[PDB]
């Protein structure tokens, strides 16, 4: 009947900042906030034991950090931004990713050779 109450922004120009897909057109602080949400989720998945999703989330976080860290504003205010992030969560993100990737590497080979062993089982004579 009536449009939902404004909650999300104050201007059209502000809403547009959420429509960008190019890093060039995304503020350091946007990504930092996005990174937080990603990190929260990453943790929840690791504990749930979903290695694929957790891995991706940790990695994406790391990929974001490695993208933004080299910007002038981040450099000057890394104190500040590390506050917004979890200080030394970039550390845990890196370590969880290697932990996970080394797990995944093995499980993906496990699934491959099984798949290959599955077919062989089918592919026999039986007169």
For the CA atoms of 50, 94, 82, 13, what is the dihedral angle to 10 degrees?
-60
What is the structure's resolution, reported in angstroms to one decimal?
A: 3.1
Q: Which among 44, 93, 87 has a CA at the least distance from the CA of 64?
A: 93
Q: Which among 61, 76, 11 has a CA at the least distance from the CA of 31?
A: 61
29 to each of 20, 69, 81, 106, 126, how far by Cα in Å?
A: 14, 11, 8, 37, 65
How many residues does the structure list for the chain? 127
Q: Specify the fold of 26-122.
A: Methane Monooxygenase Hydroxylase; Chain G, domain 1 (1.20.58)
Q: Where are the domains of the chain?
A: 26-122
Q: Which residues of 21-55 are buried (b: 16+ CB within 10 A; e: fewer)?
A: eeeeebebeebbeebeebbebbbebbeeeebeebb
How crowded is residue 115: how many other Cβ atoms within 10 Å of its Cβ? 10
Elucidation method: X-ray
DSSP 8-state class, residue 88: T
Give the Cα separation of 71 and 77 in Å (integer): 10
Asked whether 67 and 23 are in contact (CB, 8 A), the reply is yes
Asked whether 30 and 17 are in contact (CB, 8 A), the reply is yes
DSSP 8-state class, residue 5: P
Asked whether 61 and 42 are in contact (CB, 8 A), the reply is yes
- In the chain, the DSSP E strands lie at none
């Amino acid at each position: 009947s009536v449009p939902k109450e404004l909650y999300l922004s104050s201007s059209l120009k502000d809403l547009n900042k959420k429509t960008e897909v190019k890093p060039e057109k995304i503020s350091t602080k946007s990504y930092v906030h996005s990174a937080l949400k990603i990190f929260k989720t990453a943790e929840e998945c690791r504990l749930d034991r979903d290695e694929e999703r957790a891995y991706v989330l940790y990695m994406k976080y790391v990929t974001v950090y490695n993208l933004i860290k080299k910007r002038p504003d981040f450099k000057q205010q890394q104190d500040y931004f590390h506050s917004i992030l979890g200080p030394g969560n970039i550390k845990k993100a890196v370590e969880e990713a290697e932990r996970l990737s080394e797990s995944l590497k093995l499980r993906y080979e496990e699934a491959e050779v099984r798949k290959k062993l599955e077919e062989k089982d089918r592919q026999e004579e039986a007169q």
